[PDB]
C-alpha positions as a Python dict, from the first residue, in 0.01 Angstrom:
ca = {
    (1, 'X'): (0, 0, 0),
    (2, 'X'): (282, 265, 56),
    (3, 'X'): (552, 376, -191),
    (4, 'X'): (857, 606, -152),
    (5, 'X'): (1162, 694, -365),
    (6, 'X'): (1534, 680, -280),
    (7, 'X'): (1863, 739, -455),
    (8, 'X'): (2020, 435, -612),
    (9, 'X'): (2254, 247, -372),
    (10, 'X'): (2458, -74, -386),
    (11, 'X'): (2172, -246, -202),
    (12, 'X'): (1954, -208, -514),
    (13, 'X'): (2183, -377, -771),
    (14, 'X'): (1996, -707, -776),
    (15, 'X'): (1644, -564, -810),
    (16, 'X'): (1752, -316, -1076),
    (17, 'X'): (1944, -585, -1264),
    (18, 'X'): (1616, -778, -1256),
    (19, 'X'): (1421, -494, -1418),
    (20, 'X'): (1689, -439, -1680),
    (21, 'X'): (1684, -807, -1777),
    (22, 'X'): (1308, -769, -1834),
    (23, 'X'): (1380, -487, -2083),
    (24, 'X'): (1669, -646, -2280),
    (25, 'X'): (1518, -997, -2244),
    (26, 'X'): (1759, -1182, -2480),
    (27, 'X'): (1968, -882, -2596),
    (28, 'X'): (2353, -894, -2591),
    (29, 'X'): (2350, -591, -2350),
    (30, 'X'): (2554, -658, -2031),
    (31, 'X'): (2298, -540, -1777),
    (32, 'X'): (2542, -605, -1493),
    (33, 'X'): (2759, -329, -1635),
    (34, 'X'): (2468, -99, -1708),
    (35, 'X'): (2326, -138, -1357),
    (36, 'X'): (2674, -64, -1212),
    (37, 'X'): (2688, 250, -1417),
    (38, 'X'): (2350, 387, -1308),
    (39, 'X'): (2424, 335, -940),
    (40, 'X'): (2760, 516, -967),
    (41, 'X'): (2576, 826, -1099),
    (42, 'X'): (2342, 822, -794),
    (43, 'X'): (2305, 1196, -845),
    (44, 'X'): (2028, 1129, -1100),
    (45, 'X'): (1890, 787, -1002),
    (46, 'X'): (1560, 715, -820),
    (47, 'X'): (1442, 373, -688),
    (48, 'X'): (1082, 296, -575),
    (49, 'X'): (1015, 71, -274),
    (50, 'X'): (692, -48, -108),
    (51, 'X'): (608, -58, 263),
    (52, 'X'): (1215, -838, 271),
    (53, 'X'): (1048, -490, 262),
    (54, 'X'): (1346, -352, 56),
    (55, 'X'): (1276, -508, -285),
    (56, 'X'): (1304, -265, -577),
    (57, 'X'): (956, -220, -727),
    (58, 'X'): (1080, 2, -1009),
    (59, 'X'): (1342, 254, -1099),
    (60, 'X'): (1420, 549, -1319),
    (61, 'X'): (1748, 696, -1438),
    (62, 'X'): (1884, 885, -1739),
    (63, 'X'): (2209, 783, -1902),
    (64, 'X'): (2394, 1018, -2135),
    (65, 'X'): (2528, 791, -2414),
    (66, 'X'): (2721, 1029, -2640),
    (67, 'X'): (2900, 1114, -2319),
    (68, 'X'): (2982, 756, -2211),
    (69, 'X'): (3109, 657, -2558),
    (70, 'X'): (3341, 358, -2559),
    (71, 'X'): (3143, 182, -2282),
    (72, 'X'): (3044, -182, -2336),
    (73, 'X'): (2678, -169, -2241),
    (74, 'X'): (2640, 178, -2392),
    (75, 'X'): (2788, 38, -2711),
    (76, 'X'): (2587, -287, -2706),
    (77, 'X'): (2267, -80, -2686),
    (78, 'X'): (2348, 172, -2958),
    (79, 'X'): (2437, -132, -3172),
    (80, 'X'): (2104, -296, -3093),
    (81, 'X'): (1878, 3, -3149),
    (82, 'X'): (2037, 24, -3494),
    (83, 'X'): (2035, -349, -3579),
    (84, 'X'): (1666, -374, -3496),
    (85, 'X'): (1603, -54, -3690),
    (86, 'X'): (1754, -206, -4008),
    (87, 'X'): (1492, -483, -3991),
    (88, 'X'): (1216, -216, -3984),
    (89, 'X'): (1385, 107, -4094),
    (90, 'X'): (1331, 176, -4468),
    (91, 'X'): (1704, 271, -4477),
    (92, 'X'): (1636, 642, -4419),
    (93, 'X'): (1585, 615, -4045),
    (94, 'X'): (1896, 396, -4013),
    (95, 'X'): (2058, 705, -4155),
    (96, 'X'): (1891, 950, -3913),
    (97, 'X'): (1955, 722, -3612),
    (98, 'X'): (2334, 680, -3655),
    (99, 'X'): (2363, 1057, -3709),
    (100, 'X'): (2162, 1137, -3395),
    (101, 'X'): (2367, 890, -3191),
    (102, 'X'): (2701, 1050, -3279),
    (103, 'X'): (2598, 1421, -3301),
    (104, 'X'): (2781, 1570, -2995),
    (105, 'X'): (2626, 1910, -3056),
    (106, 'X'): (2321, 1732, -2917),
    (107, 'X'): (2424, 1429, -2710),
    (108, 'X'): (2162, 1160, -2648),
    (109, 'X'): (2052, 1038, -2306),
    (110, 'X'): (1888, 698, -2256),
    (111, 'X'): (1580, 714, -2039),
    (112, 'X'): (1521, 400, -1833),
    (113, 'X'): (1180, 375, -1668),
    (114, 'X'): (1084, 22, -1571),
    (115, 'X'): (841, -92, -1299),
    (116, 'X'): (642, -385, -1183),
    (117, 'X'): (291, -399, -1318),
    (118, 'X'): (164, -394, -954),
    (119, 'X'): (243, -32, -903),
    (120, 'X'): (-51, 195, -996),
    (121, 'X'): (28, 396, -1308),
    (122, 'X'): (-50, 730, -1144),
    (123, 'X'): (288, 712, -961),
    (124, 'X'): (438, 827, -1290),
    (125, 'X'): (360, 1191, -1221),
    (126, 'X'): (565, 1224, -898),
    (127, 'X'): (836, 1010, -1047),
    (128, 'X'): (886, 1229, -1354),
    (129, 'X'): (837, 1547, -1153),
    (130, 'X'): (1134, 1437, -942),
    (131, 'X'): (1350, 1348, -1244),
    (132, 'X'): (1298, 1689, -1399),
    (133, 'X'): (1428, 1866, -1088),
    (134, 'X'): (1725, 1628, -1085),
    (135, 'X'): (1781, 1729, -1448),
    (136, 'X'): (1771, 2100, -1365),
    (137, 'X'): (2022, 2059, -1084),
    (138, 'X'): (2253, 1856, -1306),
    (139, 'X'): (2221, 2113, -1580),
    (140, 'X'): (2313, 2392, -1337),
    (141, 'X'): (2621, 2195, -1232),
    (142, 'X'): (2707, 2099, -1600),
    (143, 'X'): (2687, 1721, -1528),
    (144, 'X'): (2669, 1501, -1842),
    (145, 'X'): (2320, 1394, -1752),
    (146, 'X'): (2162, 1737, -1797),
    (147, 'X'): (2363, 1843, -2107),
    (148, 'X'): (2163, 1601, -2327),
    (149, 'X'): (1920, 1735, -2593),
    (150, 'X'): (1765, 1408, -2718),
    (151, 'X'): (1583, 1143, -2510),
    (152, 'X'): (1611, 791, -2640),
    (153, 'X'): (1331, 589, -2478),
    (154, 'X'): (1272, 214, -2529),
    (155, 'X'): (924, 103, -2428),
    (156, 'X'): (763, -228, -2347),
    (157, 'X'): (459, -226, -2579),
    (158, 'X'): (232, -474, -2759),
    (159, 'X'): (-69, -505, -2994),
    (160, 'X'): (-376, -715, -2908),
    (161, 'X'): (-315, 132, -3236),
    (162, 'X'): (-53, 5, -2986),
    (163, 'X'): (-68, -53, -2607),
    (164, 'X'): (204, 95, -2388),
    (165, 'X'): (319, -112, -2093),
    (166, 'X'): (380, 172, -1846),
    (167, 'X'): (94, 355, -2028),
    (168, 'X'): (209, 715, -1980),
    (169, 'X'): (482, 685, -2245),
    (170, 'X'): (207, 722, -2502),
    (171, 'X'): (244, 1097, -2430),
    (172, 'X'): (614, 1057, -2509),
    (173, 'X'): (535, 875, -2835),
    (174, 'X'): (331, 1142, -3012),
    (175, 'X'): (611, 1395, -2955),
    (176, 'X'): (889, 1164, -3077),
    (177, 'X'): (1011, 1260, -3423),
    (178, 'X'): (1185, 928, -3500),
    (179, 'X'): (996, 619, -3384),
    (180, 'X'): (975, 253, -3482),
    (181, 'X'): (892, -91, -3343),
    (182, 'X'): (1068, -426, -3317),
    (183, 'X'): (911, -751, -3207),
    (184, 'X'): (1052, -914, -2897),
    (185, 'X'): (820, -1213, -2930),
    (186, 'X'): (1008, -1541, -2898),
    (187, 'X'): (995, -1772, -3201),
    (188, 'X'): (808, -2100, -3187),
    (189, 'X'): (967, -2439, -3229),
    (190, 'X'): (838, -2764, -3377),
    (191, 'X'): (799, -2970, -3058),
    (192, 'X'): (581, -3239, -3217),
    (193, 'X'): (775, -3310, -3534),
    (194, 'X'): (606, -3061, -3767),
    (195, 'X'): (724, -2875, -4080),
    (196, 'X'): (677, -2534, -3913),
    (197, 'X'): (498, -2408, -3605),
    (198, 'X'): (290, -2107, -3505),
    (199, 'X'): (190, -1980, -3162),
    (200, 'X'): (-144, -1815, -3077),
    (201, 'X'): (-17, -1509, -2892),
    (202, 'X'): (-300, -1249, -2893),
    (203, 'X'): (-37, -1018, -2733),
    (204, 'X'): (259, -987, -2977),
    (205, 'X'): (488, -832, -2716),
    (206, 'X'): (707, -571, -2881),
    (207, 'X'): (945, -282, -2798),
    (208, 'X'): (884, 72, -2930),
    (209, 'X'): (1200, 282, -2980),
    (210, 'X'): (1152, 659, -2953),
    (211, 'X'): (1372, 965, -2984),
    (212, 'X'): (1237, 1278, -2821),
    (213, 'X'): (1379, 1630, -2828),
    (214, 'X'): (1451, 1767, -2486),
    (215, 'X'): (1243, 2084, -2522),
    (216, 'X'): (915, 1898, -2592),
    (217, 'X'): (963, 1752, -2242),
    (218, 'X'): (795, 2050, -2076),
    (219, 'X'): (485, 1984, -2289),
    (220, 'X'): (482, 1611, -2209),
    (221, 'X'): (469, 1700, -1840),
    (222, 'X'): (165, 1909, -1922),
    (223, 'X'): (-16, 1596, -2045),
    (224, 'X'): (103, 1386, -1750),
    (225, 'X'): (-48, 1624, -1496),
    (226, 'X'): (-396, 1642, -1649),
    (227, 'X'): (-432, 1273, -1731),
    (228, 'X'): (-259, 1137, -1419),
    (229, 'X'): (-405, 1389, -1174),
    (230, 'X'): (-570, 1259, -858),
}
């Protein structure tokens, strides 16, 4: 029944590695490394807990990629948001994506916002309200994390025209200039000696990739408050 938010600490590595596995389910990304990297920059991380009694029920952090260039997980991700683009890109967005990723006039920060389905969606409004202030403070102090001008968000979605898993990222979608979708649905195998197999998944779990300009953020908050208001 009760939720609160704390800075990332070492305590939280396991629960936040669990959430990150749920995002990159079979991806090459080394979530151990990514988790380690988020906790180190505790000056922008928030972790949600419910009131043994210290399990991580969700988390939120922003990682500035252009700034951490060279890094294994950072690399593995940039390589995966491109390789899945090529399978759905039309060859022009593969061109816009690689150029956004390496711009350095406008670095790109990865937004990570993953929670357990338990937690009521309305929590999103405090959670983003807090992140924004953490962004302002880090942009006063010229930290990497506030210098970023593009938000790269990767959303759990699916189609039963598309459902969002967290459900407030829909407001992030309609402001994203470059967007596309890749299936994360696992392929079916021929258990019973057939020529091919098909699985009746009314869900088609997928992952929507979104790039958002930083300035449209203020306007996305405007839609969070009205829709998510108590």
